[PDB]
Nucleic acid binder design. Structure first.
Ligand code: ZYN
Ligand code: ZYN
Ligand code: MG
Ligand code: MG
Ligand code: MG
Ligand code: MG
Ligand code: NH4
Ligand code: NH4
Ligand code: ZN
Ligand code: ZN
Lengths: 368, 184, 368, 184
DNA sequence: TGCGAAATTCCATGACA
DNA sequence: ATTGTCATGGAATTTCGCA
DNA sequence: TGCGAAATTCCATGACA
DNA sequence: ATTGTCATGGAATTTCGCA
């Protein structure tokens, strides 16, 4: 501070202050003649305060803070002190956006069998139709085969009623859902245990995780829309038609309809495929097994040129879910306990709770 | 001649009246001819209307080429014929008083009655809730003739609920004395 | 139809039906043995009906429609007839999404002078502060210099009151705004004409068009948020501070604060730049003029590998603005009258009105 | 010694009382020393409070190093001194009864009074609405001494509202007879 | 053993609000 | 304790029909 | 006339709801 | 009759201090 700057004035060399510039005194302060002009060299004991005053004017990041400081001062390695501060500004850390994108999405393996995994989700509220406002959508993971049930609410009770009817047909090993009130209730957990079904939940606020059913919602809404063009939106009576229509629609990449993957043969619907007419059922199911295993499976896309991947013990911040007007979009920093996979992590949140969280709902805390 | 397949023929029939359960009285029974797969729908009446309402659920999953039935009123009505025609389903009737199905089907229908009877005793009024499990049972029941269960023939896979316990299906002596007492 | 198929059965060659396959009769219908199997060749007079029945099952696109048809039929150039139909399905055309992105954004030239162009916009509603709920934000195009005014509504009357106060300082040639109720009212048009100010409007529902002010809203909300961390959102009293803070914040790419571009010299604020201390004002303004013209200007980015650009007389569809639940997201097709620039067009909308519209709010009608 | 610059010195002063306009009675007048740029703020009183309220608007645009004023009550109060100190503005007072500004400023302040007087006659009650145009005028008025208008010196550009009509600024004989009548 | 055209496959785009 | 998906329609590539 | 480190410039990312 | 923008903080590149 005052010691360092003294040795300097009397012409000695101090590590960090380049020798070729003349360091004088004037108005009671140590100055220096840099190419840009004459800047005050404050004593180290003042530097934190200066960086902070600069930063606080508009809570600026690295360069915009430096440029304020540089107007009056110079010292060795200014940006280091600037960055030190940015890393300690609570307000900056919880308010700024990220500028690093998530690593490339995983493409989970397709469930191996029909009924291995259900994905379920609600659609709505829709325009009242027969007193119904929602649709329970159940999509078999492997086949894409889909069941639709109209409901009056996205409630556990309505979920349970619908799934009793569905599971008359078969019982799935696993049901995957998002964290909607309906699926996370203890009543629903019971209902599942009662049947030996494992409940599997998406990381919260990350519907891509229910992507199988979500994507089917799109088709359901799309077809419903087309069928209701120029008519009043009376959808309740179309659910069955829509279901049947979708279950029997070809996926151009697979070359199969979900019905075909589920049953290995078309039922009595229009344009039924006849290719296995001469095979015995047993020859048919044998061929179905081979078709099921040989389906196209997409791969993880290339990482964007500026992505981040979670590392154990990294400081990261979880996105606030429903941030109020003029309130920070991020929670305070927290630590990566476990890296479940490159896109899913467990974090200890300073409260501290364990939360299993999508990397998409995280940013890495800046400036370490 | 081409080999038998699922969805070639649904055999439908009613069972009832039964004691009131959640306001229901009958069961429409659908059995796929080839697979022996069974679907059950509770109705309030053996009417064309309740049949159409129920078959609309099933036929929104899979459509049979042929429905076979006896000459029940509900199945011989012209409404039901119109319904079937819309969906391009051929209707097929056994001659009156002489019901013919198939061996596989007859046996299936037998199991259904007996299995019902067994569970409706003790709780003659709670059957509505049990229809799902009654079906799972029926469908994961091993066929003596074919090496497979209906589930297996339908879906081409093992089921996640096998019924390794091939059951008594007969009335235990406790139940015969409280079945001759219930209907008294 | 029946003529064509006759000549064929009796072994003659018809253009389009390849010679090397045997075309027979069976069950009263013309059949053919193709590698895939035996398919019915319907008479041309039946083909439109068949394509339509297939398509209508789930209103499927090209391949998914073809695969249904191929199950039972074959004829020459099936997809041509399929595409013909897709192009005529009202419901498909107004309900499906686009799969072609907009051409690359324009980067308009920076206004040459302060006061050449204002961009204005409202922010809010915010949490009530002193009975105020909105903020009028006025951003000078060239400098980025910004004025803020709290309002009780995004109303013309409040716009006028604020701008009378602002235009005490100078009068702008042009004021650019979006199509908010406040800016499109005739009262506001009058107020502008009265002062010789030209009103310039964004194509509707395309805020990127007000990008200069929009982007400033972000900074305004961001700083307000930070300043209100852990306090009740009492923003009214901070507007002045925020204004001053932002107007004096460096843009790292320009190396100037908006204040500097506006005045060519810092006022008495913290960290004022002193570099022009020895220049006369006139030397200063001379240097300001040179700084103003030499500012970095970004260029139009590369086109995405699957973009479209509007062409005069093309069939295009405008996105529905506030589409109701289960209703189409697109209006019926309409024609490009004029290509104002590669990102802005005039269309005749079948009503038919002239609408000036952003290419972002259009898709090109599929299948011509 | 360094050349004179905008924001080096604001000269502030009140003008009033005037007739009620939208409930306002005074005008706080701020003139930038170097440029001669003028800002006008209507107040309801020549108080420290109304001064602070008004200067808070201006100083949220640009902050003077020095405010010069006479020894008006509002400017000599310790509240006003506290206010200035917060913003690091030095306060500067002309000795009582002997107001010194600068030539440029004195002339400016003269134009302001005369220009006001001219427009408040005929409409002594509509002046509030005219303050914006009064300022545009003052600021796009060519300086005899410097080759430029205040706008030009402030912003370094021509203005979009030049006032090529250098006006009479004097009371026409119609107005002297209805100004000696208005205040009667 | 190579051509022109049809068929099939590729794959960016966008929406599950 | 978990994880994107896939219809869509122009363009790119392969296959087909013929020689 | 070349090194290591600091400084500056680059630029994808995301939000103006 | 009109049209995206730019703070941000790691990484990439250039400049600086010294020799
Ligand atoms: C009710 C909660 C748990 N929930 C929520 C929710 O978080 N909120 C706040 C409504 C959503 C959805 C739910 O299904 C859902 O149950 C939902 O589908 N999308 C649409 C969407 C958006 C982007 C995508 F990539 C995908 Cl696949 C789907 C919005 C949010
Ligand atoms: C009131 C209308 C005309 N309006 C609307 C509007 O169209 N609706 C329906 C609210 C919007 C905005 C207005 O300012 C505005 O005035 C507005 O800023 N954004 C935020 C946004 C989103 C993406 C971007 F790229 C940019 Cl630049 C800004 C949302 C829509
Ligand atoms: Mg969803
Ligand atoms: Mg019967
Ligand atoms: Mg906006
Ligand atoms: Mg005075
Ligand atoms: N997996
Ligand atoms: N331009
Ligand atoms: Zn900060
Ligand atoms: Zn269609």
């Amino acid at each position: 501070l005052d010691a360092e700057l003294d040795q300097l004035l009397q012409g000695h060399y101090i590590k960090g202050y380049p020798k070729q510039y003349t360091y004088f005194l004037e108005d009671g302060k140590v100055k220096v003649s840099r190419p840009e002009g004459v800047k005050i060299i404050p004593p180290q004991s003042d530097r934190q305060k200066i960086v902070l005053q600069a930063h606080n004017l508009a809570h600026t990041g690295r360069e915009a803070t430096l440029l304020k400081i540089a107007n009056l001062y110079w010292w060795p390695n200014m940006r280091k002190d600037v960055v030190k501060q940015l890393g300690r500004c609570q307000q900056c850390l919880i308010t700024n956006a990220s500028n690093k994108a998530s690593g490339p999405i995983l493409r989970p393996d397709r469930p191996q069998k029909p009924f291995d995994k259900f994905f379920i989700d609600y659609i709505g509220p829709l325009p009242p139709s027969q007193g119904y406002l929602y649709v329970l959508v159940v999509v078999d993971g492997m086949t894409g085969f889909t069941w639709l049930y109209p409901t009056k609410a996205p409630s556990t009770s309505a979920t349970v009623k619908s799934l009793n009817v569905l599971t008359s047909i078969a019982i799935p090993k696993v049901i995957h859902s998002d964290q909607g009130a309906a699926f996370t209730s203890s009543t629903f957990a019971e209902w599942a245990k009662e049947r030996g079904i494992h409940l599997e939940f998406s990381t919260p606020y990350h519907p891509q995780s229910s992507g199988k059913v979500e994507r089917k919602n799109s088709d359901i809404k799309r077809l419903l829309t087309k069928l209701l063009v120029g008519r009043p939106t009376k959808w309740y009576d179309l659910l069955p038609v829509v279901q049947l229509a979708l279950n029997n629609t070809y996926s151009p990449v697979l070359k199969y309809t979900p019905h075909q993957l589920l049953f290995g043969i078309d039922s009595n619907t229009p344009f039924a495929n006849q290719d296995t007419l001469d095979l015995t059922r047993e020859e048919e199911l044998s061929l179905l097994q081979e078709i099921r295993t040989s389906l196209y499976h997409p791969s993880t896309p290339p990482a964007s040129s500026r992505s981040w991947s979670p590392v154990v013990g990294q400081l990261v911040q979880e996105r606030v879910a429903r941030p109020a007007s003029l309130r920070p979009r991020w929670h305070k920093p927290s630590t990566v306990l476990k890296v479940l996979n490159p896109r899913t992590v467990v974090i200890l949140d300073h409260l501290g709770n364990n939360r299993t969280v999508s990397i998409d709902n995280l940013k890495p805390t800046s400036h370490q | 001649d081409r080999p038998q397949k699922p969805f070639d023929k649904f055999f439908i029939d009613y069972i009832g009246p039964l004691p009131p359960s959640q306001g229901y009285l009958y069961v429409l029974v659908v059995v796929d001819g080839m697979t022996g797969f069974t679907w059950l729908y509770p109705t309030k009446a053996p009417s064309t209307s309740a049949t159409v309402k129920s078959l609309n659920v099933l036929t929104s999953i899979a459509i049979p080429k042929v429905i076979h039935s006896d000459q029940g009123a509900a199945f011989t009505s012209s409404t039901f014929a119109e319904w079937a025609k819309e969906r391009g389903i051929h209707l097929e009737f056994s001659t009156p008083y002489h019901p013919q199905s198939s061996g596989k089907v007859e046996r299936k229908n037998s199991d259904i009655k007996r299995l019902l009877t067994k569970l409706l005793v003790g709780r003659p009024t709670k059957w509505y809730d049990l229809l799902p499990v009654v079906q799972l049972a029926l469908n994961n029941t091993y066929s003596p003739v074919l090496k497979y269960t209906p589930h297996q023939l339908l879906f081409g896979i093992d089921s996640n609920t096998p019924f390794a316990n091939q059951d008594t299906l007969d009335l235990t002596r406790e139940e015969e004395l409280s079945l001759l007492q219930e209907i008294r």
